[PDB]
Amino acid sequence: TVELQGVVPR
Amino acid sequence: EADCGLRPLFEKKSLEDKTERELLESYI
Amino acid sequence: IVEGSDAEIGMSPWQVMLFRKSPQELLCGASLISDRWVLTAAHCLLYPPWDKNFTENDLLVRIGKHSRTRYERNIEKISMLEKIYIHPRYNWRENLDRDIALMKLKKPVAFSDYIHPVCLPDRETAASLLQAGYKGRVTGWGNLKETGQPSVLQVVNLPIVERPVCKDSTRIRITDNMFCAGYKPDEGKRGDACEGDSGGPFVMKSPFNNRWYQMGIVSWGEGCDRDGKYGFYTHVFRLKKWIQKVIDQ
Ligand code: NA
After folding, report:
1. d(CA C89, CA C171)
2. What is the domain range of residue C130?
């Protein structure tokens, strides 16, 4: 899950 | 689209928008 | 769009707004590529970590808008969606690879001064213009800051960033189906896309034929406009054979 890398989808 | 990417109020009227020169300048 | 400016009227006539009907909500941006085909980010439609899975009847698009302050009578237009096509190999789980969808419009929009399709890049525009330091333009009605939203469509111009700089800025396993853009912390400007801007176009004006080409789709980032971080964009030219295959079927 991309939030595990500090990322939010835009 | 044969006419794609050409804006009726800018390119099609030979008018520039306020920040497009900034784009065309970076193409060096 | 953080550190952008107000767009001029007719400046981005390819701009499309993706709305949820009920409750009425502006979800994302998008772009018009013909009279009946719209491009957006796939996570606007499908992102299971947030339980997001919109179908065609949940949604509409608005086209030709400048400002959200009022209804732009005789200018803005609206369509229902006939069909949604999300990339078969969209990878929401790992890295948002192939964050792209196509939307077929129920009724084709009439072009006007305010409504006009953008070009998809050819081999020359992709090879020539997709280079570090060359600027593109990002548009949207998303958040004005990381930590509210504009009435007038926002515009920011951002340079493409060299892939090793993009790679070392993030812990995401980035692929060739994405690129990054934005000013570096030692550079003399800033700006980024932000929340709500996904699906919006990263466009470039070709110096060769004076046409605007859509090179990217707003996709992801680590916050918005952080020093040393960059906005990532779906690489339109890499996925162009998919786009054509969908449209041609
Ligand atoms: Na940044």
Report:
1. 21
2. 1-12+118-237
Residues on chain B touching C10 (C-beta within 8 angstroms) = 7-10
Q: How far apart, in whole angstroms, are the C-alpha atoms of residue C97 and residue C90?
A: 6
Alpha carbon of C247 to those of C79, C116, C200: distances in Å? 18, 18, 19
- Which of B1, B3, B19 has the CB atom closest to C157's CB atom? B19
Count Cβ atoms below 10 Å from residue C239 Cβ, excluding itself. Answer: 19
Q: Resolution in A, one decimal? A: 2.0
Contacts with C186 (C-beta within 8 Å, 6 or more apart), sequence order: none
- Using what technique was this structure determined? X-ray
Distance, CA C187 to ligand 1 centroid (Å)? 10
Matching CATH number, B1-28, of 3.40.50.1820, 4.10.140.10, 2.160.10.10, 4.10.320.10: 4.10.140.10
- Amino acid letter for position C69: T
- Tell me if residue C85 falls in helix, strand or coil: strand
- How many Cα atoms are found within 13 Å in the side-chain-facing hemisphere of C81? 29
Neighbour tally for C63: CB within 10 Å: 26
